[PDB]
Amino acid sequence: SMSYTWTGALITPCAAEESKLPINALSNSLLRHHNMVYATTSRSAGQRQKKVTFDRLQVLDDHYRDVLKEMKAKASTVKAKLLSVEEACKLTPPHSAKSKYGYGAKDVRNLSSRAVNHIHSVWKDLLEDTVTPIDTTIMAKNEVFCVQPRKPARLIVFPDLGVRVCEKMALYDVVSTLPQVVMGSSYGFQYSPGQRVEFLVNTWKSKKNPMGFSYDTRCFDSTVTENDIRVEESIYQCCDLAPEARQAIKSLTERLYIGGPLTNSKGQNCGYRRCRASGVLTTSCGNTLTCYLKASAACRAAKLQDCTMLVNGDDLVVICESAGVQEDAASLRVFTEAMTRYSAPPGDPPQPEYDLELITSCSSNVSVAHDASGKRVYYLTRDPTTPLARAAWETARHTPVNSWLGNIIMYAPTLWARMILMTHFFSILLAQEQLEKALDCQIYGACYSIEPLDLPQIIERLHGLSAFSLHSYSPGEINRVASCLRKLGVPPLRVWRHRARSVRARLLSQGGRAATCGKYLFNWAVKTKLKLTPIPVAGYSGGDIYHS
Ligand SMILES: CNC(=O)c1c(-c2ccc(F)cc2)oc2cc(N(c3ccc(B(O)O)cc3)S(C)(=O)=O)c(C3CC3)cc12
């Protein structure tokens, strides 16, 4: 079974595409080496098509079926509800792609009679027809990166707006509640970053002689087979469901999730999909369940002892009891052989690690700093190259997703988010008097509208109060940041400290919520520190989900 078949019609853009970093009067203050930053476009879509197109063979053994049966037993305890049209409508992002049938996301959100009527007709059709493949649009994503001695565009596959609202009706409650019940503490999207870090540290310490590894499947969405998507459905069907929900889920599975025709932005047939669609409601939950199933079975095949898995989408980490360096290495090759039999070979082979900090997953690693009292605090960080490249782009261009804001929220304890992103963007917001303006950003795939003035409260909840007083960062973390700054031609950390003092003073001058940002976000910038006191579920990547 080929992941895709192609007609030769091109994957076309829906608008003008920029590959070159836009420059304005603020650009050079952040980043001087402009030619290092680029955006992917549909021009590289052909390259990605080649990468994502391959045959999938699957060999399923008793370990696989044993794990599945256990997963189904837990799924059978879940009771999920149907969302009303209105509930589903309110989960639709304001800027979500408009329907081909004469309405858009704002119409959906307002419960306009044209939108609601069409949605009712799509629902009725799902109930009555379980065979006809549902159309999807295929597009090239425009994403910004730094060059490394260029990545081709990622592809997004999604159905019409009316269908997307129907998916929410049938499955939003399922994808929100089932993964945690089936996978327990292994379901990664249940955690805030602070909770995630705590869970990783505690898990590592729970082993007598800990060993851990990341496993990254090559082109995971393309590795997902018809079997995998039917197995996912069978898990969902274990739930206590409304009869209408059961029918819609079956219909969606047969008609959309298993596969279907691919249409470009110009309406031309591009080919056919027999793998995971990247832009459906079930992408995150389906990938997580499938990765967990295959990985759990593979742990058993490799006889890994006292495994604790952490899984979110296609990202996987296993922490377990070491049997010794030589035996661990052998056991990972067996793990990999099993995963490969299940259709999920790795991009690069997994490596056993005997220090938590040497494991990288979702581009991130655990590092250590110290709070106000000198106590060790663990936090998740990453290489700041991509965040800074996207910050540079967003300095010069308004974009639908404000990666900078998401990065500040999710990487708030990091030296680079605090010193560079907070300083740079608060300066911009001050200049435009836009501190109070809500902005769109992404947390675990779901879209959120967030006012920058609420960052202190948000950071405290996701990371704890220590996120505003961390110091004595590791030499390795400091060196990675500094090295990234030289690479991109970003001013050194000393310059950012100086700018932050100014930004802080400006925020304090404003009083109110602005002053609170000054006090908490920039306490690191001042010599004599002000005493800081407390301030008064699931993943949905590609799921077209919104919250305010
Ligand atoms: C299975 N892997 C893991 O659980 C994660 C490890 C990891 C685990 C073990 C280990 F040893 C090292 C890292 O670190 C993580 C960090 C995050 N975070 C984000 C990562 C990437 C993006 B982005 O490029 O879209 C956004 C958030 S976060 C909020 O904590 O900083 C996540 C989030 C998606 C859920 C998972 C893991």
Swiss-Prot record:
- Cofactor(s) for this UniProt protein: Mg(2+)
Outcome of mutating residue 282 to V: Almost complete loss of RdRp activity
Write the signal peptide boundaries.
none
Regulation of its function: Activity is up-regulated by PRK2/PKN2-mediated phosphorylation.
What mutagenesis or variant effect is reported for residue 216 to C/G/N?
Complete loss of RdRp activity
In this UniProt entry, the residues modified to Phosphoserine are: 29, 42
Covered residues, full protein? 2420 to 2982 of 3010
| Protein name from the UniProt record | RNA-directed RNA polymerase
